[PDB]
Amino acid sequence: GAMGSMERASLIQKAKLAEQAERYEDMAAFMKGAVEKGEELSCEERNLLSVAYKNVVGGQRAAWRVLSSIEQKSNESEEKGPEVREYREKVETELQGVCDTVLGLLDSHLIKEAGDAESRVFYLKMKGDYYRYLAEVATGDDKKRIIDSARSAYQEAMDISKKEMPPTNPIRLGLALNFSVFHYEIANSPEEAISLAKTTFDEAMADLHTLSEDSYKDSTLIMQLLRDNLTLWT
Amino acid sequence: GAMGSMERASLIQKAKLAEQAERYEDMAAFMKGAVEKGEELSCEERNLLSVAYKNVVGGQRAAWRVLSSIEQKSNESEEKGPEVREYREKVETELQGVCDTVLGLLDSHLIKEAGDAESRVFYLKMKGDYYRYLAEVATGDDKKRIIDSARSAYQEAMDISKKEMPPTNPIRLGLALNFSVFHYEIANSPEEAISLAKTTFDEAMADLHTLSEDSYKDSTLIMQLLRDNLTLWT
Amino acid sequence: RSHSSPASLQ
Amino acid sequence: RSHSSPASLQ
Ligand SMILES: O=C(Nc1ccccc1)OC[C@@]12CCCC[C@H]1NCCC2
Ligand SMILES: O=C(Nc1ccccc1)OC[C@@]12CCCC[C@H]1NCCC2
Ligand SMILES: [Mg+2]
Ligand SMILES: [Mg+2]
Ligand SMILES: [Mg+2]
Ligand SMILES: [Mg+2]
Ligand SMILES: [Mg+2]
Ligand SMILES: [Mg+2]
What we know:
The complex is a heterotetramer, with two copies of chain A and two copies of chain C.
Chain A: H1 8-20, H2 24-35, H3 43-73, H4 83-113, H5 117-137, H6 143-164, H7 170-186, H8 190-205, H9 213-233
Helix pairs in contact in A: 1-2, 1-3, 2-3, 3-4, 3-5, 4-5, 5-6, 5-7, 6-7, 7-8, 7-9, 8-9
Chain C: no helix or strand
One magnesium ion is lined by residues 170, 218, 221-222 of chain A.
């Protein structure tokens, strides 16, 4: 790894600078380097890792959707040659590479060292998320297995979160939100998505009374996304 | 060049797709490949080249400004180590590399084959612009020479544009706009900047009567930027 | 599409 | 700062 010679603390500092500069590819490289030091990540460091890669893959997903739409239109009328497919495939392969990189960091060795609920759920949610992003572009004989890998990671995270975290915990909420998106957008299970979003929202509502003002703000922000989806889906 | 095996027309097509997908690094790579085919560029192709690199360097300039501001604040109070300087230098070196790449394409061999006023002025303006971006970050013993290289390119473009193009020509207007920015922001010549912006604006105003509705829209868009700067500068 | 979680979670 | 030209010019 090209970050092997940089101090862990310097990598974290530079990831924060890269975030401020909106240099998310750099930020991801710095955070990958930090992970590769082999030590566990703190809460703040896990968040930096996620911000970095979410922004990188977000640009790729947005580009892939633009290109896929153009490609589908080109098949509805004039023949334009292989270029749209080729360039969609180029972006797709790069996106798959980023997802594979994240999944590799989780498997070597973030998840296996994560013993506390907050870290383990966060990483299993991330595993589900990056398999979900792979599923968004999958079409061949492995699509079903990719979908099931996302489902399995989300389900393990859900099982831990329900046993170990209050219903308003932002990690628990974000996980449930994303698993509901998986059901609606990936698994062709809109009813499951709606039911999960509704139960998550109501159970969180009932636990808000235990929270400080700052925690209330964190939890209600994610609850609003559940509500926004329920409005789109019903 | 990694684009040597791709057809010129396919590179242009993919540059347009990359633009739609907001993949400006790809767009620049495709347009560099197109230039390296050795043929002259059409008006539309010159615009694609400029859009691609302007967006790439724009992200780098924005990042450099964020980092430079943090670095200057860190010198006003706690010592934080070499990391801010190092990362500012990393972004700076990448920015300089992009500018050097563009200047290299102009020198090998876009400018020397550009005989028509519209192409030659466009490329000389670009040369001034990329030396200007180098000047924005320059500090050592070559800063004066970088500034003078920008000035010389802009001046040659101005001399051609005044002889060969009407005052409302969008290339002429954009050149004058950027040379005025050079005077104000780089060369410590705000009066020259103001005078150039004013004379450019008034001479364009007087030529609008010759234009069609579509050309009028093109020219007045750039004239508004001259006015916006005059408001900032006075 | 649907809304998913922000990257940073407390 | 100051406004500079858009990249595309007709
Ligand atoms: O955001 C807020 N309120 C708030 C936040 C911060 C400071 C002050 C007030 O709650 C959103 C939500 C959950 C809690 C009750 C209101 C409800 N409204 C529908 C969506 C979920
Ligand atoms: O944009 C427009 N007008 C317009 C454009 C498109 C269609 C209809 C009208 O002109 C801007 C400018 C130059 C020309 C006269 C007005 C003037 N106003 C100050 C700035 C320069
Ligand atoms: Mg036809
Ligand atoms: Mg542990
Ligand atoms: Mg929150
Ligand atoms: Mg102190
Ligand atoms: Mg020629
Ligand atoms: Mg215009």
